[PDB]
Amino acid sequence: KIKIGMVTDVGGVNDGSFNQSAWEGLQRAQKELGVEVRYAESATDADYAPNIEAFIDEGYDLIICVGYMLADATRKAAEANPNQKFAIIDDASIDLPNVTCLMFEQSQASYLVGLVAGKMTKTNKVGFVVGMVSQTMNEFGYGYLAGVKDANPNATILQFNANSFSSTETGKSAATTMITNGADVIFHAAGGTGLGVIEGCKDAGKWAIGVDSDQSPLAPENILTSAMKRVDNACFDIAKAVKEGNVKPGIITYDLKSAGVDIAPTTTNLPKEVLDYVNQAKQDIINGKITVPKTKAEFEAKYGNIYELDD
Ligand SMILES: Nc1nc2c(ncn2[C@@H]2O[C@H](CO)[C@@H](O)[C@H]2O)c(=O)[nH]1
Ligand SMILES: [Zn+2]
Ligand SMILES: [Zn+2]
Ligand SMILES: [Zn+2]
Ligand SMILES: [Zn+2]
Ligand SMILES: [Zn+2]
């Protein structure tokens, strides 16, 4: 039997977003492909190495490390276990024959939801709650702020780094404070912490924007959209490659054109004018007409010092 193991990050498989979507894709892979799937949650980074080792020792054909913080542990395990195949989501630093890097152009989807936030705010203040700061996480920020400003040059983006992907209290408190200070749309790129962000928006009667999966069921009257990142499909696809015997190492990048990132399929709360505007911007990115900044220098060159979490 083909066995695929998932090592999840601190967020947990019930995060409503990143890890939950990765796991959902593996559950689908089990149903459709016949692979046997199991996950191991890591309470802290001390659990990364033994969780990887447990799948190695049990004969798993592929170990999927979900999240950029697993990179160091994945590299070390891949070097020490040349016959073991690994995949890692959201980090592309590892160049080894047994490692596939699954990357997502999240700045593209974040830009689109920033257009939504800029067009929907009535106070000209919107919020961004990020789970941690890192190169990949800042791509959410750069895209979102660029979208907000392109849609609404006079909008202010309030920003907060929760320093956790698994703290719903931090998410709720930060959202509530932003709302007290006038924000009326809040986007999170914060994993499980975002469950708190969404609850804070719902409680205050404001708009939220979710991430990774279509988070609208968590607050159907308050979610405008979500910046989708199809970690489910990427995990399914690599499971398929394992089953077929054609896993390739290196970088696989999922973008808007590949449908690997997107805005959510639920659009019930988007005015037709807004949906049309965002959909045109999506096709312009897909067709190459416009490019979203995803690094500090590119973002600052166009928007100045307005992203405060990268300094
Ligand atoms: N390293 C890591 N990143 C996460 C986690 N949860 C969310 N993220 C990131 O935050 C984004 C928004 O949830 C995801 O697409 C990931 O990039 C987690 O538990 N660990
Ligand atoms: Zn658990
Ligand atoms: Zn089926
Ligand atoms: Zn607090
Ligand atoms: Zn799915
Ligand atoms: Zn900055």
Residue numbers in the entry: 45 to 355
The authors write:
Clostridium thermocellum has extensive potential in lignocellulose biorefineries as an environmentally prominent, thermophilic, cellulolytic bacterium. Previously, five putative sugar transporters, denoted A to D and L and belonging to the ABC transport systems group, were identified in the genome of C. thermocellum, and the solute-binding lipoproteins (SBP) of these ABC transporters were shown to bind different dextrins by isothermal titration calorimetry (ITC) assays. To gain insight into the structural mechanism of the transporter specificities, 11 crystal structures, both alone and in complex with appropriate saccharides, were solved for all 5 putative sugar-binding proteins, thus providing detailed specific interactions between the proteins and the corresponding saccharides. Combined genetic, biophysical, and structural studies have provided solid evidence that transporter A and transporter B are the major glucose and cellodextrin transporters, respectively, among the five potential sugar transporters in C. thermocellum.
Four SBPs, denoted cellodextrin-binding proteins A to D (CbpA to CbpD), were shown to bind to glucose and/or different lengths of cellodextrins; and one SBP, denoted laminaribiose-binding protein (Lbp), was shown to bind laminaribiose. The structure of Lbp was determined to 1.50 Å resolution. Although no sugar was added during crystallization, a clear electron density of a small molecular substrate was observed in the structure. However, neither laminaribiose nor cellobiose can fit into the density. Considering that Lbp has about 35% sequence identity with nucleoside-binding proteins as shown by a BLAST search, we tried to fit different nucleotides and found that guanosine fits well into the density. Furthermore, the ΔtransporterL strain grew well in the medium with laminaribiose as the sole carbon source. Further studies, however, are still required to elucidate the interaction of Lbp with laminaribiose and whether it can function in laminaribiose transport.
